[PDB]
Design a protein around this ligand. Structure first.
Ligand SMILES: O=C1Cc2cc(Nc3ncncc3Cl)ccc2N1
Ligand SMILES: O=C1Cc2cc(Nc3ncncc3Cl)ccc2N1
Ligand SMILES: [Cl-]
Ligand SMILES: [Cl-]
Lengths: 4, 124, 124, 4
């Protein structure tokens, strides 16, 4: 999971 | 927004769509190419091809279970492109590049047409 | 094999599937949650959720146009997860994390359940 | 396009  | 994003989500979705295709699960159309038949999902074809997008948004054609491609279309070229639609992988070879590019132009798959043009230009 | 791969293909496919959802094009099922209705594509739901995969591979349920979820399921939690299915983006907030995790456990969306567990553990 |  990432900060888009 | 403040969303988080799962990097592998789109790839995992496509992998699962290809597993459904392999097992012939919920396929809703047959594409006929020079008497070679390919089962697929209308939504995936539309998501990948300007031609299929136009066909299945047509109020009459959206309801067809069989689509016949132009007789000039090569079944191997179509097969390679159908595999690409469901995997992101294109089996581009010296022996198939002309049929693949012609099929991608007909199907309106701009990124495929682009890499075929470039691979052809490198060999001239 | 000797394939080439188009990096953005899977993401572009999902973006196009979400555009079809937005325009209600070729949606083939309604998901009913506490009298809130959500239109979607069976194949995308199956590709994202172990529950929908099991439902639409069932020889009788595969043909249903309406699926009613358990009344304990929260419509907002479902909406957030449906958006995630079609975009890879999860709108996870302090005010919705419990409903989102409960919905992801029911829908069998393991990666979502994992990030919810981790975000909850960080706040304890 | 890349070599996967
Ligand atoms: O090269 C290409 C690939 C491609 C896909 C589509 N598909 C869609 N476009 C927009 N909203 C939904 C969909 Cl399904 C249309 C044109 C082209 N042209
Ligand atoms: O967490 C999850 C997400 C998810 C998706 C599916 N889908 C499929 N699996 C295998 N072949 C085809 C499909 Cl459509 C099954 C289980 C789970 N569990
Ligand atoms: Cl393309
Ligand atoms: Cl997930």
């Amino acid at each position: 999971w990432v900060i888009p | 927004d403040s969303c988080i994003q799962f990097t592998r989500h789109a790839s995992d979705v496509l992998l699962n769509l290809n597993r459904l295709r392999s097992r012939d699960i919920l396929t809703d159309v047959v594409i006929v190419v020079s008497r070679e038949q390919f089962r697929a999902h209308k939504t995936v074809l539309m998501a990948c091809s300007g031609l299929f997008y136009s066909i299945f948004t047509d109020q009459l054609k959206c309801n067809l279970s069989v689509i016949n491609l132009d007789p000039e279309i090569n079944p191997e070229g179509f097969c390679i492109l159908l595999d690409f639609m469901y995997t992101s992988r294109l089996n581009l070879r010296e022996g198939n590049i002309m049929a693949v590019m012609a099929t991608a132009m007909y199907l309106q798959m701009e990124h495929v047409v682009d890499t075929c043009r470039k691979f052809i230009k490198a060999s001239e």
